């Protein structure tokens, strides 16, 4: 019971930090692609200068993979390893498409094609990010139920 | 004994995702300022084009404010508001310094002064970022024992 709860809680905190990191990528894609800081609106449009943001996006992406490496549980091993492959495929795609993403002047369209998972066309990484998102979300569902059934040890066996 | 364990975990998850967002700024500040994607190294140097990166930093910064606003706990009320106040000073400072931060060609130095809290000089927002990290962590410290004392009630 006590060993169950503390160890089961660790993974949920572990997984939900990955989801928080993913939302950092998703949020800059939705609200910061093609934008600049403005004193009143907070952000203002600046088209086709998304180069440094993509580096920051990839920066968070590799921080995500490191955290996926720190997750270890025999029950969740299959879903964590499946999550392990997906972030690696995403990070590799940004490397693969460096000719369009490795400059300061990356177009909005190609920037969105890389990190905006809700974009129309998703051939520069957004497919892999969504595939990654689904793998991570499949992990939260299994990890959350592992915690709850550890706590369902309050009433009923 | 049943409700509190679930309730405090909600508080812990809420705070630790703020820090996880807080960690998203830092890592981009540490590894992406003055950088570009490279097919082999993963990142390579590209100086003085940090505008969209810093715009992204502020984007997560206001996502942090949204998350601190969703926090409500009677005990942590004074400390949550303090983290709320700190988040606004950071976001206000970044917009306040738009003359240097709102363009594609923000220098590497100015970006580090804005979002790299361990930089040498911190006159463009990193000071307010430091205060924000410190205010949130005092909130994280309180939340950790808030959960733990719920579970040490088994023996």
């Amino acid at each position, epitope marked *: 019971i006590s*060993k169950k709860i*503390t160890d089961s*809680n*660790a993974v949920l*905190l*572990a997984v939900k*930090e990955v989801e928080a990191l993913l939302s950092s990528i998703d949020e800059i894609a939705a609200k910061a692609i093609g934008k600049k800081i403005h004193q009143n609106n907070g952000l203002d449009t600046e088209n086709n200068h998304n180069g440094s943001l993509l580096a920051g996006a990839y920066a968070i992406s590799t921080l995500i993979k*490191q*955290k996926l*490496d*720190g997750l*270890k549980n025999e029950g969740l091993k299959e879903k964590i390893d499946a999550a392990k492959k997906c972030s690696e495929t995403f990070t590799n795609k940004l490397k693969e498409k460096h000719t369009d993403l490795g400059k300061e002047g990356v177009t909005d369209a190609d920037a969105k094609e890389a990190i905006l998972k809700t974009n129309g066309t998703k051939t520069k990484g957004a497919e892999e990010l969504g595939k990654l998102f689904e793998s991570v979300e499949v992990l939260s569902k299994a990890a959350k139920e592992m915690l709850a059934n550890s706590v369902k040890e309050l009433t009923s066996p | 004994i049943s409700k509190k364990i679930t309730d405090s975990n909600a508080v*812990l998850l809420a705070v*630790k995702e703020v*820090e*996880a967002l*807080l*960690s998203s700024i*830092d*890592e981009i500040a*540490a*590894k992406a300022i003055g950088k570009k994607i490279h097919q082999n190294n993963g990142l390579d140097t590209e100086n003085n084009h940090n505008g969209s990166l810093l715009a992204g930093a502020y984007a997560i910064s206001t996502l942090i404010k949204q998350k601190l606003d969703g926090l409500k706990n009677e005990g942590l009320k004074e400390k949550i508001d303090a983290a709320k106040k700190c988040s606004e000073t950071f976001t206000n400072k970044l917009k306040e310094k738009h003359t240097d931060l709102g363009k594609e060609g923000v220098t590497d130095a100015d970006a580090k002064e804005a979002i790299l*809290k*361990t930089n040498g000089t911190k006159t463009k927002g990193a000071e307010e970022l430091g205060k924000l*990290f*410190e205010s949130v*962590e005092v909130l*994280s*410290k309180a939340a*950790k*024992e808030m*959960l*733990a004392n719920s*579970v*040490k009630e088994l*023996t």
Partner: antibody, heavy 121, light 109 residues
């Protein structure tokens, strides 16, 4: 899994700076926080806390080590470092890093193997 | 400016018998105390946290009371493995600690 691995030079002349780095194994500074803190044991004496760090980097120092110590975290966060300056004799000791943290205990959980640093002329 | 004092510095117990460590705080550290084992040649091991609950991996022969300035680490029927230096530790300041001086626990003959 939760493994801490110790550090560099064991013999610095006095009044100089000794630097140590603890590198994590099977782990990272995650959830969002883990693996802060340094400890030393000098010959003929017990253990005493030196300082604490945070996943952000916020540091807390013992005092009587004030101004003397600097603890730092490495970006690409595989390791964290101890910086002690300047070092007289009697800073010679066995140095431990430790994870002074977990969700359910606020101290002091994953220990290193211990490293020896001799301060002598 | 918080003082942890183990009452005997040295303790001599026959193998198979009970050992009782005590720790005294200069002011209330509340229910925040840790007990560490330290054999010569190894790193310290964590035994007790929150002054009542034993760290996972350690035998039930270790025990702990607390809740204020009284603190006791009691080893029922201690064996050859258990002879080492034992520290108590105040940690009621979250990242800031003070150990005690230590207490060696020796074989009696």
């Amino acid at each position: 899994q939760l493994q801490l691995q110790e550090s560099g030079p064991g013999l610095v002349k006095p009044s100089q700076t000794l630097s140590l780095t603890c590198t994590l194994s099977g782990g990272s500074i995650s959830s969002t926080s883990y693996y802060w803190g340094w400890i030393r044991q000098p010959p003929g004496s017990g253990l005493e806390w030196i300082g604490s760090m945070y996943h952000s980097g916020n540091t807390y120092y013992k005092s009587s080590l004030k101004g003397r110590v600097t603890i730092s975290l490495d970006t690409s966060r595989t390791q964290f470092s101890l910086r002690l300056t300047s070092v007289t004799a009697a800073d010679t000791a066995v140095y431990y890093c430790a994870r002074l943290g977990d969700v359910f205990n606020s101290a002091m959980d994953v220990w290193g193997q211990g490293t020896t640093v001799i301060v002598s002329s | 400016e918080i003082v942890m004092t183990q009452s005997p510095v040295t303790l001599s117990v026959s193998p198979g018998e009970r050992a009782t460590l005590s720790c005294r705080a200069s002011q209330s550290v509340g229910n925040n105390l840790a007990w560490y084992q330290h054999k010569p040649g190894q790193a310290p091991r964590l035994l007790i946290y929150d002054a009542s609950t034993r760290a996972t991996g350690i035998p039930g022969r270790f025990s702990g009371s607390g809740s204020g300035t009284e603190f006791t680490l009691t080893i029922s029927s201690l064996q050859s493995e258990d002879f080492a230096v034992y520290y108590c530790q105040e940690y009621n300041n979250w990242p800031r600690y003070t150990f005690g001086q230590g207490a060696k626990l020796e074989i009696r003959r």
